């Protein structure tokens, strides 16, 4: 029965704020001139930062939690990962997918993530993972709004009945149409697959999220077709180009020309730091490229870009706890967004920009919006990122759905001293 | 009236073997536990290696034996070669083509080659060389099965009546449909020419062999269309991509993606070491690229690749004696297949893999097959390659069609000593 969040700091705002709640929504937001006393029905942010929930714009819940089953990827390569996944085929069932997806979703709830977009491989005639994920979506709805992308992993034109299966996935309820041009047999199939993807999105009124140019090939430019088609249909807001790691290898002249179109099209971009730094640059000896898309330049140009985890504890990425501040930390380093303001503003890459990517209509600490917000025990984005703080409280519909009692560290010098890693 | 080949060594097999012959075919193959005595009607391999005939998967018999006529290519360049060829136009007649083709074919018979695929330029309204080659094919049949590729040297779409002439060549009997995408005026003509090539091959039930991406251009990727179209039509076995020298210059990420399709398509690849090392890398100063396709990687991936001589004694390559062990020697060096096993297994690149490229149905030392085989005076492939041994005997239909008495070398030290270059 929470009525107020008090003593809240807000990004880009001075001072402390009080967030009033009513009927599961934010009724008003008022500045405070000092610290407010706690009381029944008040959740004290304790001068910590309050932001609208973290978002996971790109993850594969159908493959999550499978690392080491039955064997571990020892080389760490994409190739071996594919083989290790194949060895687990006998365990891939409806219940298995639901159990693993739920395990990661619980970690996400614990990490203040209330919006998740999962890709699901639909290059499977039985659509086993998709059927399982559609049930998971309904089951987790009280805690996470889950979007499902029908992802034609083996291609649309390069896989038997690929287009038919992609459309079947949409008819079953998938929220987003996926594609993977650079994986199609030819450049022509790649371009044609995008026309088919856009046609399906318009036919069913769905969003689009393409695994776009995820390859260190300076000639992989499917992103220009994604942006051009979006501009032509006037649907930029509903379109996302995931990865675009090839952009890391483009010459500057083409990239400059392309950026005009990217801005005009209004499409969204997702970079996946943890996985990109790991899987890109694998064909280089030395020097080795970083392989993340042009995040810094997109921000400078006002192009919406955000960060996803992509994989959690699977053959393609053995690590992760589904933590967005960890994803952000990696991205700030690899993209060299290390100035104070760049780091502080970093939270945008895992909150607001990701909400835009998911085309969310009810997101942000604003009057009238649902009371969905989280509290970080930190002074600002810089502090939260530097100390990799947990989510103190996650509030959804005005109710607490997760909480973390912080770790307590003590050093025993001449006298015991508490250490909080602040100066 | 040969009834048996005795004391034969076979690649990948231990010991000695006896090959029984009946009615021009191999009736049975039995292992020996020791050396068998010679006798009437037995051809003694003398513990030498017996293999199914050498194959020439790619040669231009229409241009062979013309070097220095009327003038020599002094720079050695492709450009000058084209000019030197043009200066000989008055001599290019029906009889001239037949005489020169036969001269090289005799060298091939002497070198144990019983299967040859020759390309013939059909960008000539009079189709002079093609008509001559069709007669040569009939004439040489007792010794060599000759396949003729209708090769549109000046392009299909970029030359007047190019497509009509290509089809006319097929209606006259050419066995294989050729193409040369990278030489077409535009990338679009290149791709379209391949669709036309595949349509003709299906219309006439012929094989396909494309002069594919023979250029140091990292953007020349016609090979993906060749492989995709073959996969689509389910005809990989009947398709060959010759040269693919551009692949030597591709970035690794694209090449890795492409390899999946190359393996799935089942198409064949021909590298032409002697000519590729000579004509590729000509626009580099220093360092200079080798320019041969990814032979080592194809072998590692189980993709069928083999070696051709391409040109013999002409403006584009002034050397050669049409010797496949010499072609192999160059390829092993340039492709760095220099480990013992890689060298020993090298014979596959000029025998079995080439037979697959030609879609041969009667090839190999196996019961039921025609008795077509050759005997090398060497212990194994490594030995034959190292010593560049001649073909001791070439047997076709159970009859000897060629034989070489080995050279005899003596050094006169304190006493005369025979030298055989074995340790
Ligand atoms: Fe992904
Ligand atoms: Fe050729």
């Amino acid at each position: 029965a929470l009525q107020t969040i008090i003593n809240a700091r807000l990004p880009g705002e001075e001072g402390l704020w009080q967030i009033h709640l009513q009927d599961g929504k934010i009724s008003a937001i008022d500045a405070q001139s000092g610290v407010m006393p706690i009381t029944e029905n008040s959740l004290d942010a304790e001068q910590g930062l309050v932001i609208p929930p973290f978002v996971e714009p790109h993850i594969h819940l159908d493959t999550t939690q499978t690392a080491g089953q039955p064997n571990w990827n020892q080389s760490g390569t994409l190739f071996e990962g594919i083989e290790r996944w194949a060895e687990r085929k006998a365990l891939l069932t409806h219940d298995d997918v639901k159990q693993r997806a739920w395990q990661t979703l619980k970690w996400q709830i614990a990490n203040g993530i209330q919006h998740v977009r999962t890709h699901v491989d639909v290059s499977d005639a039985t659509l086993t993972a998709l059927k399982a994920m559609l049930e998971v979506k309904q089951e987790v709805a009280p805690w996470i709004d889950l979007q499902i992308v029908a992802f034609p992993q083996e291609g649309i034109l390069s896989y038997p009945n690929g287009e038919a299966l992609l459309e079947e996935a949409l008819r079953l309820g998938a929220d987003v149409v996926g594609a993977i041009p650079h994986f199609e047999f030819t450049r022509e199939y790649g371009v044609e697959s995008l026309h088919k993807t856009f046609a399906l999105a318009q036919k069913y009124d769905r969003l689009i999220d393409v695994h776009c140019d995820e390859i260190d090939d300076e000639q992989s430019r499917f992103v220009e077709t994604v942006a051009a088609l979006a501009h032509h249909e006037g649907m930029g807001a509903r379109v996302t180009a995931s990865h675009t790691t090839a952009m890391h290898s483009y010459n500057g002249a083409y990239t400059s020309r392309l950026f005009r179109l990217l801005k005009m099209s209004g499409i969204n971009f997702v970079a996946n730091p943890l996985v990109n730094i790991h899987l890109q640059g694998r064909f280089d000896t030395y020097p080795k490229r970083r392989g993340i898309t042009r995040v810094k330049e997109m921000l400078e140009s006002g192009i919406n870009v955000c960060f996803g985890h992509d994989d959690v504890f699977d053959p393609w990425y053995p690590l992760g706890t589904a933590n967005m501040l960890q994803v952000l930390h990696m991205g700030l380093h690899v993209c060299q967004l290390m100035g104070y303001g760049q780091i502080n503003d970093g939270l945008n890459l895992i909150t607001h920009h990701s909400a835009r990517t998911l085309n969310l209509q009810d997101y942000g600490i604003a009057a009238g919006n649902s009371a969905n917000l989280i509290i970080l025990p930190a002074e600002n984005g810089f502090d939260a990122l530097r100390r990799q703080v947990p989510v103190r409280y996650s509030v959804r519909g005005g109710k607490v759905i997760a909480s973390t009692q912080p770790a307590q560290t003590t050093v025993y010098l001449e006298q015991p001293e508490a250490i909080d890693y602040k100066r």
Side-chain angles (χ1 to χ4, degrees), chain A:
Chain A
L2 289 180
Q3 304 189 306
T4 324
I5 309 305
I6 63 173
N7 299 144
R9 286 183 186 292
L10 301 170
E13 297 296 335
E14 305 288 356
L16 297 174
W17 303 74
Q18 188 166 188
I19 303 170
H20 301 95
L21 315 175
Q22 180 173 54
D23 302 314
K25 294 180 183 181
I26 297 175
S27 58
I29 299 157
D30 302 306
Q32 302 175 190
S33 57
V35 176
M36 283 286 172
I38 180 57
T39 188
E40 311 73 61
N41 301 307
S42 278
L43 187 59
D44 193 0
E46 296 178 341
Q47 301 185 249
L49 196 68
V50 175
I51 53 172
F54 282 135
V55 178
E56 169 52 89
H58 189 127
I59 190 166
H60 292 257
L61 295 179
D62 54 343
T63 63
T64 192
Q65 308 290 172
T66 59
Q69 308 176 338
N71 303 302
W72 292 98
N73 186 167
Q74 294 289 5
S75 68
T77 63
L78 167 66
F79 178 82
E80 176 167 356
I82 295 177
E83 289 190 0
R84 294 289 170 269
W85 175 255
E87 300 180 322
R88 192 182 184 285
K89 195 172 191 57
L91 299 304
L92 190 63
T93 65
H94 182 84
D95 289 347
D96 171 61
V97 171
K98 295 182 66 178
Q99 193 283 322
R100 292 185 288 93
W102 255 113
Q103 180 57 279
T104 291
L105 287 161
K106 290 184 188 182
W107 294 2
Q108 294 176 308
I109 295 167
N111 296 338
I113 297 166
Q114 298 187 199
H115 294 99
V116 178
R117 166 176 289 176
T118 182
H119 287 78
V120 177
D121 186 350
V122 296
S123 297
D124 170 4
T126 69
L127 295 174
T128 297
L130 174 70
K131 291 181 293 187
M133 207 63 66
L134 284 162
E135 290 181 5
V136 173
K137 172 177 175 179
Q138 287 185 173
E139 298 172 359
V140 78
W143 304 279
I144 288 176
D145 296 275
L146 183 66
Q147 288 185 187
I148 291 167
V149 186
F151 173 50
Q153 171 76 86
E154 307 292 328
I156 294 170
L157 294 181
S158 307
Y159 184 81
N161 301 311
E163 191 177 356
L165 288 168
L166 180 59
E167 185 162 7
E168 182 178 359
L170 299 179
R171 291 188 287 94
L172 287 165
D175 306 291
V176 191
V177 195
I180 186 175
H182 78 274
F183 195 67
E184 301 281 358
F185 294 160
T186 68
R187 191 185 190 281
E188 288 67 40
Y189 280 7
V191 173
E192 184 54 31
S193 73
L194 294 178
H195 282 274
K196 290 176 176 300
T197 296
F198 274 78
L200 284 168
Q202 291 296 64
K203 177 175 179 180
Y204 293 90
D205 190 10
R206 302 293 160 81
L207 306 179
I208 291 173
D209 190 318
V210 181
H211 275 67
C212 200
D213 306 308
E214 190 192 4
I215 182 174
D216 295 319
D217 176 10
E218 79 284 348
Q219 295 173 51
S220 193
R221 299 175 170 187
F222 294 108
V223 65
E224 69 180 19
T225 293
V226 175
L229 287 179
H231 183 86
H232 178 73
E233 299 282 346
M235 60 186 290
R238 292 160 58 208
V239 180
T240 298
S242 281
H243 288 299
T244 64
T245 54
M247 201 187 295
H248 192 266
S249 299
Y250 292 171
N251 61 68
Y254 171 71
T255 304
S256 182
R257 194 285 281 165
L258 176 69
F259 261 51
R260 175 175 175 267
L261 163 62
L262 303 188
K263 184 58 179 298
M264 289 172 72
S265 75
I267 70 171
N268 303 287
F269 293 85
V270 173
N272 294 308
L274 298 172
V275 176
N276 293 158
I277 193 65
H278 156 52
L279 298 181
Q280 301 301 137
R282 291 275 180 167
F283 299 92
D284 283 339
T285 51
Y286 280 103
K288 217 177 296 286
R289 73 200 70 210
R290 291 163 190 236
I292 290 60
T293 193
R294 303 190 183 217
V295 178
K296 177 182 285 181
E297 292 71 23
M298 289 172 176
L299 291 171
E300 290 172 352
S301 295
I303 287 165
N304 189 238
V305 57
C306 65
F307 292 160
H309 196 127
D310 200 2
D311 294 272
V312 172
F313 215 175
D314 71 23
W316 293 269
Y317 186 77
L319 302 174
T321 51
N323 201 80
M324 305 318 291
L325 279 173
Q326 189 174 89
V327 173
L328 174 58
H329 175 278
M330 183 60 64
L332 298 175
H333 284 75
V334 179
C335 300
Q336 293 175 330
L337 288 162
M338 299 288 289
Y340 179 77
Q342 295 173 322
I343 294 169
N344 192 54
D345 289 349
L347 290 187
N348 285 154
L349 296 163
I350 53 178
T351 54
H352 291 100
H353 292 190
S354 299
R356 178 160 167 45
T357 293
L358 266 57
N359 201 219
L360 302 185
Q361 307 299 131
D362 184 2
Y363 185 95
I365 308 303
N369 282 181
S370 296
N372 299 346
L373 54 87
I374 64 177
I375 300 176
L376 307 182
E379 299 180 48
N380 46 225
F382 176 89
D383 190 40
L385 184 286
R386 184 178 69 83
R387 296 188 296 108
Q388 292 290 104
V389 305
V391 169
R392 186 69 181 85
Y393 293 107
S394 176
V395 178
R396 188 173 171 73
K399 290 177 169 54
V400 173
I401 57 167
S403 67
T404 289
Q405 185 180 74
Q408 296 177 183
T409 302
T410 304
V411 291
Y412 303 93
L413 310 181
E414 299 204 314
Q415 295 282 178
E417 176 172 352
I419 299 298
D420 62 4
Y421 303 96
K422 296 197 269 281
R423 64 179 167 186

